[PDB]
Ligand binder design. Sequence first.
Ligand code: 90I
Ligand code: 90I
Ligand code: CL
Ligand code: CL
Ligand code: NA
Lengths: 305, 306
Amino acid sequence: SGFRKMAFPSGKVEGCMVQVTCGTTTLNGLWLDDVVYCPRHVICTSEDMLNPNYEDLLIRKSNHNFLVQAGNVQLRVIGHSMQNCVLKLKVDTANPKTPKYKFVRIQPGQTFSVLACYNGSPSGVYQCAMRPNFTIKGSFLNGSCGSVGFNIDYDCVSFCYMHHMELPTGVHAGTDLEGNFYGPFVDRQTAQAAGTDTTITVNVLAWLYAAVINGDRWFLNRFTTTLNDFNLVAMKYNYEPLTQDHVDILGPLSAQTGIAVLDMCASLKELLQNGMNGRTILGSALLEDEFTPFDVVRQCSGVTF
Amino acid sequence: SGFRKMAFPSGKVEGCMVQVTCGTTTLNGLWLDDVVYCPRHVICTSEDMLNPNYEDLLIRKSNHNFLVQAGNVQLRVIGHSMQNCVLKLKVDTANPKTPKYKFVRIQPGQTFSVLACYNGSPSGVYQCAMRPNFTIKGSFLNGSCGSVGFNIDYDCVSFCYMHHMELPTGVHAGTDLEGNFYGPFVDRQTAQAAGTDTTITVNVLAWLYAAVINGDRWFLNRFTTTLNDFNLVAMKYNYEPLTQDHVDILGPLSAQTGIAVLDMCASLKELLQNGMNGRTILGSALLEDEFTPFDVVRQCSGVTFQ
Ligand SMILES: *[C@](O)(C(=O)NCCc1ccccc1)[C@H](C[C@@H]1CCNC1=O)NC(=O)[C@@H]1CCCN1C(=O)OCc1ccccc1
Ligand SMILES: *[C@](O)(C(=O)NCCc1ccccc1)[C@H](C[C@@H]1CCNC1=O)NC(=O)[C@@H]1CCCN1C(=O)OCc1ccccc1
Ligand SMILES: [Cl-]
Ligand SMILES: [Cl-]
Ligand code: NA
């Protein structure tokens, strides 16, 4: 028993991290097969970072302008191209540690593991969720750009995030591995506000199920409700709407606990209206919303990679 | 910016995890060089778990009674020895993925990363702290025994924990890699229970410093305290005593923020008195005690956001 914020084992990703330098700029790259992926703003100076013409800055560059370092070995760049906000550096050597992988784009509410890296060296791993406002609450310092987020399924790494930005409130923004930003953000040094965030309702429900599985039951009650009535409460408390799909997705946890979703929705409804009355749930005084239904089942069933 | 429960990258430990089977019993082992370390209760049967005589159980085993599997490769056991509550199986192959490593026994309050494993395969990684009562608040299911805890400061893996038990309150107990338990626990199914736990005061203060570094000062106040007056108050909330060693360890964080340690103690005293009044600190509505001073310096910027 027990319930912890748990990240995927990071070893398959660690073997892919490299250092990329262009001029005085150094950040991290992802080395898969014979291509290194990194943020396109590696080609920028600070003057460029206000209003960068990435089109013109890249046609000025050549292969020799890029230094790629894998551990203590230099990788020779033999081609370069841009895809959206990502730079693709073709190198002369295929990464012998390349895992089975695919590039995926995740939806708000979904979670992933971040391997925070500096100068091509992994530093730490933690679990994040894509917020409804398309930011992530990460932990990133200067030099972390190019760090990636991922999920693992059996032996297959699904890369979903590359780090690019920190916003004025200290939350973070990035792209998928095809260089498309999550959220209404652009890669330049301008003030860009994260939109007002909301709470991920289906994940709060998933975490309440985890609490029941772990013996925390004080919030269960005799009442049930309907989607419509609950969604009016959700909107009142800046929670995301709950859809029938979310109810279906909570099936496995509803099957494991023998508690109906609209049953649990009535519990969450009262928690929002009355608070916790000085009690905690799974060691938290807040309603936690960065565990997905899949995250709960995987952790409570010991799934292995 | 940001502040997260941050584990070490687990790859160096993943390459050491194997499956150990004896009889119908399977758990995890740690393969370093030509030795596989695992909990000695892998040799137990249903009856033997209340008062196992491990010396008598082990002398009856042959090397071929131990099946060690590294992924898809069977490792041949060529010898075995028991050290305290750990079994050491000599194998005929040295692990080519063995990292630079050492064994360290940690003190209560220290943190480490746990690589939770089942059947020799990693499931996930998370941060833990050794509680003052020598338990850890883990996430462990049947089959997780032999999973290990570690730090990797400066590219050297320091193994500090091997998982052996879940106690009736749902918390967890185990050994160092020399097989000595943390706390008063034993690898028997006889009634055991953890002592009353307490909050790791020096870690809470470290985390309040992290909050200041990241730009939050709402909880500070104009007062100070003596060390002894602080401990008289904090112990009324089941906080561990704060020692001069702890004050010294907090020095670098005090220097970076300009907040004297005993002035931060005065803030904590008021936070215990008042609660947070609807506010949060670094995203939490409770006072967090599983970040050490070292952890905060590891993760936070060296430049305070004034
Ligand atoms: C990230 O770009 C990085 O790690 N940079 C490494 C070194 C470097 C690369 C390119 C150019 C110069 C230097 C960095 C990571 C941030 C910094 C702090 N925490 C993080 O997560 N991200 C950025 O600097 C990005 C690049 C485009 C602009 N930007 C950014 O964060 O803008 C926010 C902003 C800052 C100041 C003023 C206005 C907006
Ligand atoms: C751990 O031993 C394990 O993973 N076992 C897997 C299969 C197996 C191996 C060897 C022998 C038998 C079976 C297991 C992990 C626990 C279970 C649930 N969560 C966990 O972390 N730990 C145990 O079962 C240990 C072994 C010695 C006794 N024990 C235990 O947990 O007993 C609990 C207890 C009962 C009464 C009083 C005090 C403690
Ligand atoms: Cl220690
Ligand atoms: Cl109070
Ligand atoms: Na109900």
